[PDB]
């Protein structure tokens, strides 16, 4: 009782080292996103369709957003949780939905349990700039634009506080209340919101993480001395 409960101690120490230094970044990084978000607003604001008018009703397409390279507590395992609960009733058909998996953590989920996935956008980025999803966005529209999509949809990880963020699913292509660049930017709107939320969700799990280490450490330490 004098050796590899100190390993447990040193290791738990190290973990403590990094979760807090990444807690630093979760807020370093995913607050910047807020800037690179409320900037869209400007152009996000300047505002029978090509067909982006309410029509019915066969093959629908999903676009579920998740972190790739994630360490953000549940906020990634409870949006997959939600596409995999809501499609549970929308699948008595073998149309097989089809998802546009953005982010590698949702990606892998979808290729372990068949879904399947017609697109898997490589490596998110944290900016995320202009040339990044103007593919999957553009081509997720392109599949409504003639015409294998009667409806599009993202699974957005909406950002309330940095302490919370809610699994939300919006609908994109069949609009509501030549120019569908709107759709493309809508996907910005979420892809951008989906970011904050992740690291929003990431520092929250990192503080909790740090703390949990301290605590747990302070448990372990009793064993360091009293046999």
């Amino acid at each position: 009782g004098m050796r590899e409960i100190k390993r447990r101690i040193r290791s738990v120490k190290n973990t403590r080292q990094i979760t807090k230094a990444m807690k630093m970044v979760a807020a370093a990084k995913l607050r910047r996103a807020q800037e690179t978000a409320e900037n869209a607003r400007p152009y996000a604001d300047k505002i029978s369709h090509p067909m982006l008018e309410a029509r019915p009703v066969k093959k629908t397409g999903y676009m579920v957003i998740t972190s790739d390279r994630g360490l953000a507590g549940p906020y990634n395992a409870n949006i997959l949780r939600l596409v995999s609960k809501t499609i549970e009733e929308r699948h008595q058909s073998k149309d097989e939905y089809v998802i546009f998996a953005v982010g590698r953590k949702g990606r892998d989920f979808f290729k372990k349990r068949g879904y399947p996935v017609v697109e898997e956008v490589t490596g998110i980025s944290d900016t995320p700039s202009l040339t990044e999803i103007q593919d999957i966005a553009q081509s997720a529209i392109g599949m409504f634009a003639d015409e294998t999509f009667d409806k599009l949809t993202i699974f957005y990880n909406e950002f309330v506080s940095p302490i919370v963020q809610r699994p939300v699913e919006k609908q994109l292509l069949p609009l509501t209340s030549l120019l569908p660049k709107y759709a493309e930017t809508l996907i910005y709107s979420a892809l951008l919101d989906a970011k904050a939320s992740e690291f929003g969700a990431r520092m929250t799990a990192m503080g909790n993480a740090t703390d949990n280490a301290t605590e747990m450490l302070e448990t372990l330490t009793l064993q360091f001395n009293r046999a």
Partner: protein
């Protein structure tokens, strides 16, 4: 000499804010030299430079998209990929001069890339022609 705003702005952030003396642009059905006192005017633009003068300092601008917006006062165009007279990376255009130009001759038959890389041969020529005007 009066003045009127001409703020070309990409989806991300603003581009040219400063008041414009006299403006020029190349639309699809003609040439729109933006000024002051116009009526409401909206129509698809081209991949054209809108050298938005602010002190008689003239310089071509890189644009490829966006729609038009004109009034008795203001003018805001929601162009796609656009940048400043110096943000135009000459070297990123030296790649399309060997990426898109050297491949537009392979496959044909069905319409295709004479308008997904030759239209790109306009953005890949603007970032070299407009690349001159950096002052």
């Amino acid at each position: 000499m009066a003045t009127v705003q001409v703020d070309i702005v990409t989806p991300e952030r603003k581009v040219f804010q400063g008041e414009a003396d006299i403006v020029i642009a190349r639309g699809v059905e003609g040439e729109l030299g933006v000024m002051a006192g116009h009526i409401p005017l909206v129509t698809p633009l081209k991949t054209a430079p809108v050298r938005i003068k602010q002190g008689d300092k003239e310089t071509l601008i890189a644009v490829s998209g966006g729609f038009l917006e004109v009034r008795p006062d203001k003018v805001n165009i929601l162009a796609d990929t656009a940048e400043l007279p110096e943000e135009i990376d000459v070297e990123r255009a030296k790649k399309a001069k060997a990426r898109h130009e050297t491949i537009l001759k392979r496959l044909d038959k069905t319409d295709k890339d004479y308008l997904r890389h030759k239209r790109a041969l306009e953005r890949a020529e603007v970032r070299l022609q407009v690349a001159n005007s950096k002052s």
